Amino acid sequence: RSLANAPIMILNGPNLNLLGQRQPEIYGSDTLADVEALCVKAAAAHGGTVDFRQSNHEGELVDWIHEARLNHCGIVINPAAYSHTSVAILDALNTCDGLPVVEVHISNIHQREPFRHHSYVSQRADGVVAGCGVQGYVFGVERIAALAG
Amino acid sequence: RSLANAPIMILNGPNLNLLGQRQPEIYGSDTLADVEALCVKAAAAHGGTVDFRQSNHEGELVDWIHEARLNHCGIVINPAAYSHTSVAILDALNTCDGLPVVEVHISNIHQREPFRHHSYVSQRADGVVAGCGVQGYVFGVERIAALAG
Amino acid sequence: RSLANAPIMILNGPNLNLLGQRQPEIYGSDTLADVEALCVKAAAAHGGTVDFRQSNHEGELVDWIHEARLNHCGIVINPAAYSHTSVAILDALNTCDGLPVVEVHISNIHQREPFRHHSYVSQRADGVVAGCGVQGYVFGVERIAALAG
Amino acid sequence: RSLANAPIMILNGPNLNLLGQRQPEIYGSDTLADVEALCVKAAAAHGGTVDFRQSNHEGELVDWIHEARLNHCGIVINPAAYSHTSVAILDALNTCDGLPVVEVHISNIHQREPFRHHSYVSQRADGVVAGCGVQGYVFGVERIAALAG
Amino acid sequence: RSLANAPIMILNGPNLNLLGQRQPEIYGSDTLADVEALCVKAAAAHGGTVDFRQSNHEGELVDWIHEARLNHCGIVINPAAYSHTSVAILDALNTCDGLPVVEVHISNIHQREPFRHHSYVSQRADGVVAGCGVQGYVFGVERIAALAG
Amino acid sequence: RSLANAPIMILNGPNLNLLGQRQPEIYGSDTLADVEALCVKAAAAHGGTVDFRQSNHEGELVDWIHEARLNHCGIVINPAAYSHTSVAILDALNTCDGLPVVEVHISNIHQREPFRHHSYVSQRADGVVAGCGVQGYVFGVERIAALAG
Amino acid sequence: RSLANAPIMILNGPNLNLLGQRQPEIYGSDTLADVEALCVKAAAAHGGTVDFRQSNHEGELVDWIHEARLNHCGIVINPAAYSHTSVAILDALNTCDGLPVVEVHISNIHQREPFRHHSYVSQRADGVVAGCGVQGYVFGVERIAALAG
Amino acid sequence: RSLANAPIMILNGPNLNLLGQRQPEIYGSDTLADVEALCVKAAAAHGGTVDFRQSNHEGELVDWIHEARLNHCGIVINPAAYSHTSVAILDALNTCDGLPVVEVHISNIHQREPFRHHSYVSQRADGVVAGCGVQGYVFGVERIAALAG
Amino acid sequence: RSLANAPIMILNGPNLNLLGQRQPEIYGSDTLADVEALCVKAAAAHGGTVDFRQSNHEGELVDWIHEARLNHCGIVINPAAYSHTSVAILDALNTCDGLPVVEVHISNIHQREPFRHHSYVSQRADGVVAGCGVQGYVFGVERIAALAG
Amino acid sequence: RSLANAPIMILNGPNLNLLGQRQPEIYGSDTLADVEALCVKAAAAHGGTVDFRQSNHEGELVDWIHEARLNHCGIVINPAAYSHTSVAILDALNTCDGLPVVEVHISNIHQREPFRHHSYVSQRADGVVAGCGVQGYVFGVERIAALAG
Amino acid sequence: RSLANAPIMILNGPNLNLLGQRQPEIYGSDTLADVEALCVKAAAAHGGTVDFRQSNHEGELVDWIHEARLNHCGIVINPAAYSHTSVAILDALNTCDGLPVVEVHISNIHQREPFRHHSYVSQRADGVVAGCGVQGYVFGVERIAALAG
Amino acid sequence: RSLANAPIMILNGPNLNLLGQRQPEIYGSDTLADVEALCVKAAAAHGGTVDFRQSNHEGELVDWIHEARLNHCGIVINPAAYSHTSVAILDALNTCDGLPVVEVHISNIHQREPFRHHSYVSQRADGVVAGCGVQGYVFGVERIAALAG
Ligand SMILES: O=C(O)[C@]1(O)C[C@H](CCCOc2ccccc2)[C@@H](O)[C@H](O)C1
Ligand SMILES: O=C(O)[C@]1(O)C[C@H](CCCOc2ccccc2)[C@@H](O)[C@H](O)C1
Ligand SMILES: O=C(O)[C@]1(O)C[C@H](CCCOc2ccccc2)[C@@H](O)[C@H](O)C1
Ligand SMILES: O=C(O)[C@]1(O)C[C@H](CCCOc2ccccc2)[C@@H](O)[C@H](O)C1
Ligand SMILES: O=C(O)[C@]1(O)C[C@H](CCCOc2ccccc2)[C@@H](O)[C@H](O)C1
Ligand SMILES: O=C(O)[C@]1(O)C[C@H](CCCOc2ccccc2)[C@@H](O)[C@H](O)C1
Ligand SMILES: O=C(O)[C@]1(O)C[C@H](CCCOc2ccccc2)[C@@H](O)[C@H](O)C1
Ligand SMILES: O=C(O)[C@]1(O)C[C@H](CCCOc2ccccc2)[C@@H](O)[C@H](O)C1
Ligand SMILES: O=C(O)[C@]1(O)C[C@H](CCCOc2ccccc2)[C@@H](O)[C@H](O)C1
Ligand SMILES: O=C(O)[C@]1(O)C[C@H](CCCOc2ccccc2)[C@@H](O)[C@H](O)C1
Ligand SMILES: O=C(O)[C@]1(O)C[C@H](CCCOc2ccccc2)[C@@H](O)[C@H](O)C1
């Protein structure tokens, strides 16, 4: 699918509903709603739209990836903690043959606790953006626009 | 419980809803419905019935194992990604005292990425079948029939 | 929040709904309902009340932690299997700035299988109690009572 | 080769000559001769025949694998202790281009000592069946029948 | 022995004689004397008494455990550094067949340096309390009273 | 410095002089000169300029980071093989107090050989972009513009 | 069986046929026939006899262990290199229910190359003697004589 | 020194004072006094004498090794828990140039918990006897008598 | 011995009998007989002869090494799978004091599966040639010629 | 405290009483009395004194650290074997807030056995000197003199 | 390119300029000029020439590999210490599509320190010769002649 | 060479040119020129002179080490980041047969990031001084003056 004909799915994992409410030195002072606004703008800038979602449930994320697989032009995903633990989410993305996927982390996980350094999602994501703040979501959109082109 | 008196629960974990839609060289071109049909036949051949279910949700699979513990003669389980990650499903199966459990993987996980080599479920499953394709499910049923009688 | 003004949230993870039904040499013969009753009395003995919940779903536990963050005076959590696998629950507890958290394991996980020895939750929990049976929940409540005053 | 034209090679590694004489809780009370008779019946149930062999010598098993490579329709192998140590048997099976191979362990090796968890043979065996008792051999023959036709 | 007929041995390992003199954000500002008074009070509240001792010598602590084995109703031990290094103290506790043992750490060691995460003592201690401050000694006493009655 | 007052230093490590000449499926068919041209355009589109350089020599890269520290508004760096090996470049970037740094990899290093998964540079770079092709350089320029401007 | 009624089997693994021909500072100057003579002497001192064998073939050692199981009052084994590699010999000793087994190493393997530090045979051998020179075989014989009476 | 002119020092590490009082299936029913008596007679059987000591204190054991270095013809040492932890006792034995040293474990430490499998003392001890019960002390005396005569 | 007075022993490990019959991209399409013929001419070109042998049996290879130790001027060995598993063959080659030993692998084992990267034989072989095709045997012969001259 | 007002404590761990009686190539021919004299001299050159002590007992060393914390101007310590094993001594030193501490090893521990490479003391010691011979203690005195002024 | 039309590049890494000046029992007494003469002779015997170079600088070796890629018929490389550390040289070699590469080490790195056992270079070199002294360069030349033909 | 006859080479690795410009709490406020001046006076205090140099290039440091080998009486080296990565600098120092070498780190590397704990240079450096600040250079010079003496 192209940007013109289907939205980009923007998926957000656990706890990100609280973005902005603490640790601004690490994650900024923008809320999740502010991030959504940034993505709407960035997609529009490239002639597309987004479908922006958040969940604390691993299985829900899986279901939403199966939906993206049939209905969206690409996925930008910040899997949050499930980055480090979910093989299920990796396998869900693996079923998205041909679909552009960009993983985003607001923080630079490489500078944090050792368990945070690894991501299962990175094994499928076409591109991985870490430590660019909420601007990383914009880069995710920009990359999908380039690929679904 | 005997096969005569209660169904075999066949549980399928995340992403197996899409079986048949990709990677046929590894997983075959049969769909999950085709697998269900195979299981119905295999169980009938032995005078039993099946209760075949699939979920992308770890917690729903746990709930379902608690249901089998009370109501079913055995479990054949393809835990999918959760094989590698879910201590909660191992613990659920551990509550099934005396119930036959056979774990099944369509692919030979030992020939895949190193993180797929290990399974928590195998620590409780009475038998583990991997790399026998969808026929593995029929072996699961055949084992439970031998054990539940 | 003080004990006087808000309940203590007591969370229980997967499989603990079946407490009492097996392995009494390790977990005791009290049911989860008995445990809730113990907690109610322990909280009362210190001028408090509890909000006692159990779920097999990792996402629901996260959702509940976010509720406690805003509405409760502390958390006593037995994360069960999710102790060993859930970065998502660790992250949820980490959003609870200032809130007292005590992690409770009925069994002494240090005497069990190697994978049980480690807990993500212990990275945030203020106190960790293990192997004190269900009395551990009483210690959790007594700790929150000491800290939330 | 088909089942019609050539036997299934069934190979058994060291110590399995003493099967039935101890540890019946783990390995059953059937003797290796009883297993051979089970395999003859299982293969006949699918229009085939077997060539059933046992040796304590790694190099003899490699020799027999080379024989199967040219003269048999598939291999069912319980490599016993060599499963865990023999790169030579792995390399021998690797020479069997296109031949169906199923590895069988009577016990569920994933429940035993840590060194028993890993198998070189599993890196080539199409299918691996563990913890299904001597019925595993039946499943091995069933799989070969399905593949060799 | 019961609480009524013999004292609880409370053992404290190296450097704890200086408790209260530094790092109060981690260990609080109570002195060891203050901790002893807390233990006296807690034991009295359950009809018991304590025998409170501290040593910087691993072999003295071993001697004292042998004494408790014969003369006391239980042991509450904060082995301090020796928690991480002393198989000898673990072996001594292992000689105390039937005796209740609770291990206490004032700080939550799981949040500290990696070498502090593991304790040999926790392989024998019935219960392990970490990060509850000096109130963890009170939990120790409460647990022994529960078990020794 | 701001973008208006100083150029962005764009540094490329060993072997990137041959970009475009092989493995286009991984690295694209743009040459390093093409990438320079993209960076110059990207910077201009945010009111800045670039100082683009490539070297095969670890100590020359260190020298050039010292120069950036004093004369440039930020560093975009693709350290190539030295990402995995060079503590010296990490130390060099550490001296750049307050300067924005973005590391870029054309390929998704997390999908490649295990030694390629780790980067010393990511321990200082503010943001890390991987697998977004040459467009990742544009993202680096965009990030620096956001941080400097 | 007792010493009176059956010989002690003494088994020597690969390369021990050349004992005494090299490295005397490590292994001594006695030949394997001198070792056999020491064993004959030791057993006679205790009213027994020995059946002393050496082989370079793992499968042959397995076969001889099966013989001892049925025909000898105990096994003294120097498995040589196969100590470090042979799960098959371990499994063969494991079949020897009730039979006294002592493992002997002429050199102190714990002082040599790290791969020599571990032995699979020590997981079953009742006693293990290392670094006592050829007098270790004598200690072997003495141990069997104590146990087989 | 020879057996004729000086005693063999026999050192016993922590907790062995309690030998005989528990776990007889592992350690036997002999007391440490019984073992001292066994040693007196085994030395006399070879024209020697012994100086038999036990301590729970690592430094005392090092002090006694210094004394033996100057005053005794050999050392038989069961270091108990300190086998696994004490570099200080390894360094002490290392000062005993030319003195025969035999390490003894009553139990076969290679069949116990993993941390018990390794011994620092084995890095110097000339010989190491494990799993021969208290007879292992006799073998230690026998070896010293052979070396020091 | 010299090349003039004795043959070079050229030993080939398990499965090499089948060289030529598969995977020519890795191993070439020469048969083992063709390699033998290459060896004969390489040795003659330096005034020597060969004794060329192949076995699937570890023990036989050991026995043949003992023969070469007394009867031949050097050993060129491709231990095949046993390169990775056989301490026994290492120890056999260690008995060959002063005899030139060159290890050969047709394929570059360092580019293959991780378990293939390590060889016990290389701990004794004077020289190790890998990935030079069957020409590597020729280099082996050339090296023996150089050393035995 | 200044050098003018209190002595420097010089602590030596186990086995150093024997310094100079062996292994001169590693540790020199000076005795521990010679080392004391060198410290007296070095301290006097800087207007100070020393309190020079040696013990084989970990607990005594801890006791002496507590003494120094209150009574001395700094600590030079060669912990000997306890360097590698004693978290208790590290903890003792950690209580010496603000006190200068320099760790000395006569040998370069980095060139010795792997277990010797690591030191717990180095985690606190302000400075660590290894492989400078007995002259390392003069450097420790010189560093205390610099810091304590 | 063929040997007739272009020289073989022979590259030597750090410190090899001092070959011959020490450790002759490991590296021989030939100087690097002697090695160059051996390479000139061996190439001439096959109708070719060499371009022999040595550098202590990693980046200069990379530069020279790039030169070879365009101008030479093959590379024989002794990367010396950079074998073990340089992903940059590996990457340089990887750009040499279709070019024969042979890696040489004069000493048998597998008999040396553990860090020396691994080479990045070997992941690309076609052939790797180790432990054959300076004759290994001759094998390198002989291999390139065979492949360039 | 003696101190009287030739300068001590004092070599500084990458980034040290910026000493004094940041992180004074770890590295002090002296600049590299101030260090040089300190070394000049230290050497003069012992009748010697210094040749003080700094480079960011690994190969240049190796070249300088070869120069020292022929022309200088010793080496004091702070390899900075190359401590942790440069086998090349180790190998160069290894060529300096008989030459005294002391490694200096201004910061105590053992208290920093885990990768900084290890130094290849320390495998050859006779002495290693860490965490003594710039005074560590003076210790180096003092040690050289003692050894060249
Ligand atoms: O930095 C990221 O984007 C992460 O994906 C965020 C996760 C944390 C999710 C919650 O983020 C919040 C940040 C601030 C306030 C509330 C939630 C963490 O598990 C990953 O390791 C990195
Ligand atoms: O081979 C299996 O049965 C697995 O359990 C399947 C999982 C993947 C489930 C998704 O399977 C599909 C296969 C084809 C098409 C769609 C999904 C995988 O994570 C395990 O490692 C092995
Ligand atoms: O000991 C605990 O409380 C645990 O948190 C319990 C978990 C298991 C929960 C299920 O517990 C039951 C106990 C008795 C009967 C049924 C379930 C386990 O996964 C952790 O490793 C330790
Ligand atoms: O469970 C299996 O089939 C095994 O392949 C059996 C092997 C042991 C073979 C000997 O089996 C006997 C069973 C009963 C009685 C005697 C021998 C063991 O090494 C593997 O770990 C798993
Ligand atoms: O947190 C605990 O209770 C510990 O057991 C205390 C030990 C430290 C004993 C010294 O404690 C002091 C605390 C404050 C002031 C002085 C000493 C430490 O080694 C363990 O890792 C955890
Ligand atoms: O993907 C990247 O940008 C890297 O930084 C590139 C490096 C290789 C630089 C040379 O790349 C070329 C690509 C195409 C053609 C020639 C060189 C590789 O060492 C890193 O692992 C990832
Ligand atoms: O020390 C031993 O007895 C060994 O078992 C001997 C084996 C070596 C058998 C060959 O022994 C010889 C000794 C001297 C001369 C020839 C062979 C070795 O692989 C084990 O690690 C230790
Ligand atoms: O590459 C080599 O020469 C090996 O020594 C060959 C062995 C494989 C032997 C069988 O070789 C064949 C090759 C082609 C066709 C048949 C057998 C393998 O185990 C080693 O890892 C490396
Ligand atoms: O090199 C040192 O100073 C040590 O701290 C000394 C210890 C050994 C103490 C005994 O030193 C002696 C030297 C000569 C003679 C007797 C003892 C050792 O455990 C450390 O690894 C390094
Ligand atoms: O054995 C080889 O050729 C090496 O590549 C040599 C390197 C060292 C080259 C310096 O060699 C010299 C040998 C003698 C005299 C001077 C330098 C070493 O780092 C590798 O681990 C193995
Ligand atoms: O403590 C040291 O001397 C170090 O060798 C310095 C290196 C850092 C070199 C740059 O140091 C500067 C210090 C202050 C200001 C600028 C640079 C670091 O990589 C080592 O791990 C430890």
Tell me the two tokens of residue D61: 């098993």
Between CA E52 and CA E8 the distance in angstroms is 8
User: Closest by alpha carbon to L142, among J135, J107, J48?
Assistant: J135
Q: G46-57 burial, b if ≥16 CB within 10 A, otherwise e? A: bebbbbbebbbb
Order of all β-strands in the sheet with B101-105? B50-54, B8-12, B74-78, B101-105, B127-130, D127-130, D101-105, D74-78, D8-12, D50-54
Element (H, E) at I128: strand I127-130
Compute, in angstroms, the gap from residue A38 CA to the centroid of ligand 1.
18
For residue D130, list chain B residues with Cβ-Cβ distance below 8 A: 127-129
Residue D131, chain B, CB below 8 Å: the answer is yes
What is the full DSSP assignment across L1-36?
Answer: --TTTSPEEEEE-TTGGGTTSS-HHHH-S--HHHHH
Question: CB–CB of D3/D48 below 8 Å?
Answer: yes
The experimental method behind these coordinates is X-ray
Distance CA H24, CA H18 (A): 11
Rounded to the nearest angstrom, the minimum Cα separation between E12 and chain C is 19
What's the rounded Cα separation, in Å, for the pair E63 and E81?
17
Q: How far is the C-alpha of H1 from the C-alpha of G147, rounded, in Å?
A: 34
Residue with tokens 């010691």: J125
Label residues B118-128 b or e (16+ Cβ within 10 Å = b): bbbbbbbbbbb
Size (chain J), residues = 149
> Per residue, what are the HEC states of K123-137?
HCCCEEEECCCCHHH
How many other CB atoms are there within 10 angstroms of residue A26's CB atom? Answer: 13
Q: Do chains K and A touch (3 or more CB pairs under 8 A)?
A: no
For F16, list phi and psi in degrees, rounded to 5: -70, -15
User: How many contiguous H segments (helices) and E segments (strands) does chain E have?
Assistant: 6, 5
Residue with tokens 């835990």, as numbered in its chain:
B79
CB J128 within 8 A of CB J75: no
Directed axis angle between helix L58-71 and helix F58-71, to 10°? 120
Whether the CB-CB separation of A100 and A147 falls below 8 Å is answered with yes
At C11 the three-state DSSP class reads strand
Determine whether B114 is exposed, middle or buried from the number of CB atoms within 10 Å of its CB (0-12, 13-18, 19+).
Answer: exposed
Residue-level length of chain K: 149
In chain K, which residue's Cα lies nearest the Cα of F19?
K95
Cβ of I111 less than 6 Å from ligand 8:
no
Which residues, 6+ apart, have CB-to-CB distance to B58 below 8 Å? A58, A59, A88, B82, B86, B88, B89, C56, C57, C58
Ligand 5, CB within 6 Å, residue ranges = E 15-16, 18-19, 21-23, 27, 78, 80-81, 83, 105-107, 109, 116; J 91, 95
* Beta-carbon separation of B139 and D132 below 8 A: yes
- Cβ-contact K10, K52 below 8 angstroms: yes
Residue L52's H or E segment, with its range, is: strand L50-54
CB contact set of H105 (below 8 Å; sequence gap of 6+): H78, H83, H128, H129, H130, H131, H136
Burial-class residue G134 by CB neighbours within 10 Å (0-12, 13-18, 19+): buried
Expressed in angstroms and rounded, the spacing between residue F88 Cα and the centre of ligand 6 is 19
CA-nearest residue of chain K to I128?
Answer: K130
What amino acid occupies position I121? Answer: V
- Residues of L with CB below 8 A from J142's CB? 135, 139
Q: Which of J66, J91, J120 sits opposite E80 (nearest CB)?
A: J91
Taking the C-alpha atoms of residue H37 and residue H50, their distance in angstroms, rounded to an integer, is 10
**L46 is a catalytic site residue:** no
- Cα atoms in the Cβ-side hemisphere of radius 13 Å centred on H88: 27
Quick check: helix, strand or coil at residue G109?
A: helix
Cβ–Cβ under 8 Å, residues A59 and B17: no
Distance CA L122, CA L108 (A): 14
- Chain H nearest-CA residue for J21: H95
A34 in Cβ contact with A20 (< 8 Å) = yes
Q: What is the DSSP letter of L47?
A: T
Q: In what order do the strands lie in the sheet with G101-105?
A: G50-54, G8-12, G75-78, G101-105, G127-130, H127-130, H101-105, H74-78, H8-12, H50-54
Q: Is the CB of A129 under 6 A from ligand 1?
A: no
Distance CA K14, CA J146 (A): 40
Residue C8 has φ and ψ, to the nearest 5°, of -85, 130
What tokens appear for K81 in the block?
A: 């210490």
- Mutate: best of G15, G31, G120, partner I, most I CBs <10 A: G15
Choose among J22, J6, J3: nearest CA to J106.
Answer: J22
Q: Mapping DSSP to helix (H, G, I), strand (E, B) and coil, where does residue J38 land? A: helix
C-alpha dist (Å) from residue E139 to E13, E40, E42, E102, E135: 18, 13, 9, 9, 7
Helix (H, G, I), strand (E, B) or coil at K30: coil
Catalytic residue, candidates L82, L105, L120, L137: L105
H-type helices in A48-134, by residue range? 58-71, 82-85, 87-94
Sheet of strand J101-105, all strands in order from the earlier edge strand to the far edge: J50-54, J8-12, J74-78, J101-105, J127-130, L127-130, L101-105, L74-78, L8-12, L50-54
Rounded distance between C-alpha atoms, residue B19 and residue B78, angstroms:
12
Choice from A30, A78, A135 to test ligand 1 binding pocket (greatest atom count within 8 A of CB): A78
C-beta F29 within 6 A of ligand 6: no
Alpha carbons G86 and G122: distance in angstroms, whole number: 11
Q: Is G84 annotated as a binding residue?
A: yes
Report chain I residues whose CB lies below 8 A from the CB of K108: 122, 125-128
Question: Within chain H, how many helices (H) and strands (E) appear?
Answer: 6, 5
CB A89 within 8 A of CB A51: no
Task: Return the amino acid letter for E83.
Answer: S
Rounded to whole angstroms, how far apart are CA atoms L142 and J129? Answer: 13
Pocket test for ligand 3, best of C11, C109, C121, C122 (most atoms within 8 A of CB): C109
Task: Tell me if chain G has a CB within 8 Å of the CB of I90.
Answer: yes
Distance from CA of D132 to the nearest CA of B (A): 5
Helix and strand tally (H, E) in chain B?
Answer: 6, 5
Q: Nearest 5°: phi and psi at D43?
A: -65, -40
Contact (CB, 8 A) for A11 and A81: no
CA distances from I28 to I14, I20, I22, I140, K99 (A): 17, 6, 8, 18, 18
Helices F87-94 and F58-71 meet at what angle, rounded to 10?
10
Nearest-angstrom CA–CA distance, E47 and E31: 25
Contact residues, C window 36-55, toward B, CB-based 8 Å cutoff: 55
Chain C nearest-CA distance from A102, in A, is 21
Consecutive H or E run containing G87:
helix G87-94
**Tokens at residue E113, please?**
């340096």
Q: Out of K57, K85, K88, whose CB is closest to F15? A: K88
Contact C84, C116 (CB under 8 A): yes
Cβ-based neighbour number of residue F23 at 10 Å: 14
> For residue I83, what are the CA distances in angstroms to D88, I79, I128, K64?
10, 5, 11, 35
* A22 vs C: CB within 8 A: yes
How many C-beta atoms surround the C-beta of residue L114 within 10 A? Answer: 9
Contacts of residue K98, defined as CB under 8 A and 6 or more positions apart, other chains included, come to none
Q: How far is the CA of A116 from the centre of ligand 2 (A)?
A: 25
| Chain E residues within an 8 Å CB radius of J58 | 57-58
Q: Is A134 helix (H, G, I), strand (E, B) or coil?
A: coil
> Is G90 in Cβ contact with D85 (below 8 Å)?
no
CA atoms within 13 A of residue F33's CA, in its CB half-sphere: 1
CB contact under 8 A, G85 and I90: no
For residue J146, count CB atoms less than 10 angstroms from its CB and return exposed for 0-12, middle for 13-18, buried for 19 or more.
middle
Burial I13-37 (b: 16+ CB within 10 A, else e): bbbbbbbbeeeeeebbebbbeebbe
Largest Cα span, chain J: 41
Please write down the HEC assignment for all residues of C68-125.
Answer: HHHHCCEEEEECCCHHHHCHHHHHHHHCCCCCCEEEEECCCHHHCCHHHHCCCHHHCC
The encoded tokens of residue I33 equal 């007989």
Handedness of CA C26, C29, C31, C34 (dihedral sign): negative
L124/F83 Cα distance (integer angstroms): 27
- E-only strand ranges, chain K: 8-12, 50-54, 74-78, 101-105, 127-130
Please tell me the distance from the alpha carbon of residue G8 to that of residue G49, in angstroms, as a whole number.
Answer: 6
Terminal C-alpha separation, chain F: 9
I134: tokens are 């069957």
Give yes or no for A82 touching C (CB within 8 A).
yes
Q: Whose CA is nearest to atom 7 of ligand 1?
A: A80
Is there a contact between B2 and B106 (Cβ–Cβ < 8 Å)?
Answer: no
Q: Which chains touch G (3 or more CB pairs under 8 A)?
A: D, H, I
Handedness of CA D52, D58, D63, D68 (dihedral sign): positive
Contacts of C117 (CB under 8 A, 6+ apart): C109, C110
Contact status, residue I102 vs residue I145, Cβ threshold 8 Å: no
Asked if I68 contacts I9 with a C-beta cutoff of 8 angstroms, the reply is yes
Q: Report whether G76 contacts D3 (CB < 8 A).
A: no
Q: Given a contact as 3+ CB pairs under 8 Å, which chains touch J?
A: E, H, L
Quick one: which of I54, I28, I46 has its CA closest to I132? I28
I–C touching, 3+ CB–CB pairs within 8 Å: no
| C-beta of D105 in contact with ligand 4 (< 6 A) | yes
Task: Tell me how far apart the alpha carbons of residues L2 and K132 are, in angstroms, rounded to a whole number.
Answer: 39
Residues 6+ apart with CB under 8 A from G32: G12, G16, G17, G18, G19, G20, G54
Identify whether the C-beta of residue B87 lies closer than 8 Å to the C-beta of residue D73: no
Contact of D53 with D33, CB cutoff 8 Å: no
SS3 K107: coil
The best mutation among B16, B56, B102 to test binding of ligand 2, ranked by most ligand atoms within 8 Å of the C-beta, falls on: B16
Resolution of this model in Å is 1.7
Tokens representing K134? 């300076």
**Substitution candidate for ligand 2 out of B15, B110, B120, B137 with most atoms within 8 A of CB:** B15
- Three-class secondary structure of residue H19 per DSSP: coil
Structural domains present in chain I: 1-149 (3.40.50.9100)
Query: Measured in whole angstroms, how far is the alpha carbon of residue E93 from the centre of its chain?
Result: 12
C126 vs C149: CA distance, rounded Å: 15
Residue C8 near chain A (CB below 8 Å)? no
Q: List the residue whose alpha carbon is closest to atom 13 of ligand 6.
A: F19
CB I141 within 8 A of CB I76: yes
Q: Please tell me the distance between residue I16's alpha carbon and the centre of ligand 8 in angstroms.
A: 6
- Report the 10 Å Cβ neighbour count for F33: 12
Q: What angle do CA J43, J45, J48 make, to 5 degrees?
A: 40
| H or E element in which residue F145 lies | helix F135-148
Q: Which atom of ligand 3 is nearest to the CA of C105?
A: 3
Q: Is H123 on the interface with G (CB under 8 A)?
A: yes
Write the DSSP assignment of chain D as a string of letters.
--TTTSPEEEEE-TTGGGTTSS-HHHH-S--HHHHHHHHHHHHHTTT--EEEEE-S-HHHHHHHHHHHHHH-SEEEEE-TTHHHH-HHHHHHHHTSTT--EEEEESS-GGGS-GGGG--SGGGT-SEEEESSTTHHHHHHHHHHHHH--
Element (H, E) at H11: strand H8-12
Contact by Cβ (8 Å): H95, H69: yes
C-alpha torsion H129→H133→H135→H137, nearest 10 = 50
| Nearest Cα to Cα of residue E122 among J52, H115, C65 | H115
CA distance H21 to E95: 9
Alpha-helical runs (H) found in E28-129: 32-45, 58-71, 82-85, 87-94
Local structure of residue B132 (DSSP, 8 states): S
Q: Do B95 and C59 touch (CB under 8 A)?
A: no
Q: How far is the alpha carbon of J57 from chain L, nearest alpha carbon, in Å?
A: 25
Nearest to L74 by CA among L133, L9, L4, L139: L9
Atom of ligand 3 nearest to the CA of C24: 14
- In the 8-state DSSP scheme, what is residue G27? H
Tokens of A112: 């944090």
Q: How far is the CA of K87 from the centre of ligand 8 (A)?
A: 28
- Bridge-partner residues for C5, per DSSP? none
Nearest residue, CB atoms, I62 vs list G14, G22, G115: G14
CB G75 within 8 A of CB G6: no
F-chain residues within 8 Å CB-CB of K115? none
Q: How far is the C-alpha of H28 from the C-alpha of H35, rounded, in Å?
A: 11
Q: At what angle do helices G32-45 and G135-147 cross, to 10 degrees?
A: 30
Give the integer Cα–Cα distance in Å for F76 and F80. 12
3-state secondary structure of F11: strand
Q: What is the largest CA-CA distance in chain A?
A: 41
| Best CA proximity match to K41, nearest among K141, K149, K128 | K141
